[PDB]
Structures are given as structure tokens and as C-alpha cells.
Enzyme design. Structure first.
Site, PDB file in Angstrom:
ATOM      1  N   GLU A 101      51.110  26.363  51.929  1.00  0.00           N
ATOM      2  CA  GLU A 101      50.066  26.476  50.892  1.00  0.00           C
ATOM      3  C   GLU A 101      48.771  25.813  51.336  1.00  0.00           C
ATOM      4  O   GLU A 101      48.810  24.773  51.983  1.00  0.00           O
ATOM      5  CB  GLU A 101      50.486  25.812  49.582  1.00  0.00           C
ATOM      6  CG  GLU A 101      51.784  26.357  48.987  1.00  0.00           C
ATOM      7  CD  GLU A 101      52.997  25.515  49.366  1.00  0.00           C
ATOM      8  OE1 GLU A 101      53.000  24.894  50.453  1.00  0.00           O
ATOM      9  OE2 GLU A 101      53.906  25.404  48.539  1.00  0.00           O
ATOM     10  N   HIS A 136      38.758  39.143  33.098  1.00  0.00           N
ATOM     11  CA  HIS A 136      39.377  38.553  31.941  1.00  0.00           C
ATOM     12  C   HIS A 136      40.162  37.294  32.283  1.00  0.00           C
ATOM     13  O   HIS A 136      40.335  36.443  31.428  1.00  0.00           O
ATOM     14  CB  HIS A 136      40.205  39.589  31.161  1.00  0.00           C
ATOM     15  CG  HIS A 136      41.592  39.810  31.672  1.00  0.00           C
ATOM     16  ND1 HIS A 136      41.965  40.938  32.382  1.00  0.00           N
ATOM     17  CD2 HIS A 136      42.718  39.059  31.524  1.00  0.00           C
ATOM     18  CE1 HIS A 136      43.258  40.851  32.662  1.00  0.00           C
ATOM     19  NE2 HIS A 136      43.742  39.729  32.145  1.00  0.00           N
ATOM     20  N   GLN A 185      57.947  24.910  44.087  1.00  0.00           N
ATOM     21  CA  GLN A 185      58.541  24.244  45.275  1.00  0.00           C
ATOM     22  C   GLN A 185      57.532  24.216  46.423  1.00  0.00           C
ATOM     23  O   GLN A 185      56.678  25.100  46.550  1.00  0.00           O
ATOM     24  CB  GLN A 185      59.785  24.996  45.715  1.00  0.00           C
ATOM     25  CG  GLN A 185      61.004  24.840  44.846  1.00  0.00           C
ATOM     26  CD  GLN A 185      62.203  25.543  45.453  1.00  0.00           C
ATOM     27  OE1 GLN A 185      62.200  25.892  46.639  1.00  0.00           O
ATOM     28  NE2 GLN A 185      63.238  25.757  44.645  1.00  0.00           N
ATOM     29  N   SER A 189      47.784  39.682  35.959  1.00  0.00           N
ATOM     30  CA  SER A 189      46.402  40.143  35.913  1.00  0.00           C
ATOM     31  C   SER A 189      45.616  39.570  37.019  1.00  0.00           C
ATOM     32  O   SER A 189      45.846  38.419  37.429  1.00  0.00           O
ATOM     33  CB  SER A 189      45.785  39.719  34.600  1.00  0.00           C
ATOM     34  OG  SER A 189      46.317  40.557  33.591  1.00  0.00           O
ATOM     35  N   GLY A 190      44.720  40.364  37.592  1.00  0.00           N
ATOM     36  CA  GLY A 190      43.894  39.887  38.659  1.00  0.00           C
ATOM     37  C   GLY A 190      44.445  40.160  40.036  1.00  0.00           C
ATOM     38  O   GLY A 190      43.688  40.130  41.013  1.00  0.00           O
ATOM     39  N   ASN A 249      56.541  30.131  46.221  1.00  0.00           N
ATOM     40  CA  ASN A 249      57.262  29.553  45.089  1.00  0.00           C
ATOM     41  C   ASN A 249      56.356  28.624  44.364  1.00  0.00           C
ATOM     42  O   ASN A 249      55.881  27.645  44.910  1.00  0.00           O
ATOM     43  CB  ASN A 249      58.543  28.835  45.558  1.00  0.00           C
ATOM     44  CG  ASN A 249      59.463  28.470  44.415  1.00  0.00           C
ATOM     45  OD1 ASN A 249      59.033  27.910  43.419  1.00  0.00           O
ATOM     46  ND2 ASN A 249      60.750  28.686  44.602  1.00  0.00           N
ATOM     47  N   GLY A 302      50.213  37.250  33.458  1.00  0.00           N
ATOM     48  CA  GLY A 302      50.303  36.393  34.604  1.00  0.00           C
ATOM     49  C   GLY A 302      50.146  37.159  35.893  1.00  0.00           C
ATOM     50  O   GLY A 302      49.944  36.545  36.943  1.00  0.00           O
ATOM     51  N   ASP A 333      36.521  45.233  34.718  1.00  0.00           N
ATOM     52  CA  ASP A 333      37.358  44.064  34.727  1.00  0.00           C
ATOM     53  C   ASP A 333      37.534  43.575  36.159  1.00  0.00           C
ATOM     54  O   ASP A 333      38.577  43.788  36.776  1.00  0.00           O
ATOM     55  CB  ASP A 333      38.704  44.304  34.049  1.00  0.00           C
ATOM     56  CG  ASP A 333      39.439  43.032  33.679  1.00  0.00           C
ATOM     57  OD1 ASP A 333      40.603  43.164  33.207  1.00  0.00           O
ATOM     58  OD2 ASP A 333      38.896  41.931  33.897  1.00  0.00           O
TER      59      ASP A 333
HETATM   60 NA    NA Z   1      54.902  26.522  46.691  1.00  0.00          NA
END
Ligand code: NA
Length: 240
Positions: free
Chosen positions: A69, A45, A64, A188-189, A61, A186, A93
Site C-alpha cells: 500500500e 458524487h 489487513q 462508486s467511482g 485487503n 462503496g 458524474d
Molecule cells: Na491492506
């Protein structure tokens, strides 16, 4: 996640943020689990809309620079072929996303360990949900990754009348339902991580909560049961 606590930044290194392009910017929409260096497991979904998606691994975060990342585009989306978007209660799902590049593993970025096929958790098993979803019903997304302790509710109880009745299927796991802690929009998954034989494994993909609200007593958060889909997942990865 309602009623959560901030996660330590190296606790849940298989958690990803699935984001979509929103003007000049990117917005978090769903969670997921890194399962190969170039594959993510999420809910079907979450990828119903015809958006441009990217995955962020090593994220803590949303708002930030964490200095950890990696940002990767989604190259292919494989949704479970029985998924029906106006029928989340039927199950299926789950979706797999093939990433445009393979990510590099480190203490913030690791593959999620999946349960063995057919595994079912005993009632009241210890688990944590993680995500950046709303922190209150009708609230706002978390800034930093949250975790909440959500013990499982077995099928017999979860499918009983005062819980979810017929809506919950044996292909799902329920957890929580205390009225204080839960998944929320938010989340979900994303993963439900459960400690079994000393090792956390990802037993659930967050699927739905009540329309009465996120943290509602006797409406535990409902997840796709990963251990029902082990063959499916392996088949998809082997064929792509
Ligand atoms: Na970040």
C-alpha cells in the site's frame, strides 16, 4: 460488488480506495482509477461531502497490511463543472483528484488506460467491475477487492422502458442487469474494465444503481462513459 469473486492482487493495479477520516481512523467510501502518478479519476458524487480524503494505491485487503500500500493525501478536487448532486441522472458524474505526492509504480500500482475519445462498446461486450463495495444490498463492505463479470447493455436497450428509460444518457455505459451480479454502495467511482483489442481499458466510472437494490434484473449498473470525457480530463490535467 454483489456476486463477485476475489480478485488476484495484481490483476487491477489502477484501482484505488478513496477513504475519509473518521475519528482516529480512515474509512473506505469510494473507488477510483489512477490515471497519472499524481491524479485519480473518481465519481463526482463520491466527493460531494466536505470530508478529509486520502487515496490508497496497492490496496487489496482494507482491514489487513498487504505490504504493498501507498497512502497519499488529496491536494485538489476538480469536479466536472456541469455536475449537479441532486441529479445524478443528468450525468457528468466524474471528478479528478490531484494527489499530494506522486505514487511509485510497480506490479500493484499502474496507470489505468483510457479509451480513445468517442469509443462506444458493442452490446454485450466483456467487462469487469472491481471494488470493495457492499457484497449484498444493505450488506457490508468487502474485505478484499472483488471483481464481477458485467457485459455491457447498449444504449438502445438500456434506455428502453423496462430498463432505465430516460434516466440513462448516451454519456453513460450500462453493464450487467442479470439480477445476480452488480455494483453496490462503496463501488462508486471505481472502474469498469473492458477488454478491447486484447487490452483492458477503463471505459466506465461507477455512478449509480437502482433504489430497488444493487442487483436488480433489468437495472444494470450505470457508469459514466469515460470516452465522453477524454478532452475534459486532458484539459484539467494540463491546466493543473
Ligand atoms: Na491492506
Amino acid at each position: 460488488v454483489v456476486g463477485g469473486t476475489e480478485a488476484q492482487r495484481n490483476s487491477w493495479p489502477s484501482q484505488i480506495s478513496l477513504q475519509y477520516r473518521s475519528g482516529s481512523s480512515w474509512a473506505h467510501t469510494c473507488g477510483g482509477t489512477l490515471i497519472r502518478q499524481n491524479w485519480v479519476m473518481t465519481a463526482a458524487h463520491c466527493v460531494d461531502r466536505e470530508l478529509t480524503f486520502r487515496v490508497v494505491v496497492g490496496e487489496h485487503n482494507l482491514n489487513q497490511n498487504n505490504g504493498t500500500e501507498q497512502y497519499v493525501g488529496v491536494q485538489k478536487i476538480v469536479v466536472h463543472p456541469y455536475w449537479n448532486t441532486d441529479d445524478v441522472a443528468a450525468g457528468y458524474d466524474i471528478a479528478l483528484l490531484r494527489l499530494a505526492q506522486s505514487v511509485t509504480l510497480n506490479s500493484y500500482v499502474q496507470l489505468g488506460v483510457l479509451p480513445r475519445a468517442g469509443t462506444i462498446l458493442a452490446n454485450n461486450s466483456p467487462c469487469y467491475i472491481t471494488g470493495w463495495g457492499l457484497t449484498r444490498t444493505n450488506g457490508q463492505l468487502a474485505q478484499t477487492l472483488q471483481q464481477a463479470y458485467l457485459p455491457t447493455v447498449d444504449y438502445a436497450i438500456c434506455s428502453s422502458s423496462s430498463y432505465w428509460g430516460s434516466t440513462v444518457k448516451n454519456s453513460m455505459v450500462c453493464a450487467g442487469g442479470d439480477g445476480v451480479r452488480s455494483g453496490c454502495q462503496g463501488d462508486s467511482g471505481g472502474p469498469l474494465h473492458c477488454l478491447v483489442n486484447g487490452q483492458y481499458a477503463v471505459h466506465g466510472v461507477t455512478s449509480f444503481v437502482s433504489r430497488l437494490g444493487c442487483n436488480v434484473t433489468r437495472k444494470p449498473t450505470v457508469f459514466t462513459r469515460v470516452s465522453a470525457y477524454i478532452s475534459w480530463i486532458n484539459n484539467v490535467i494540463a491546466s493543473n
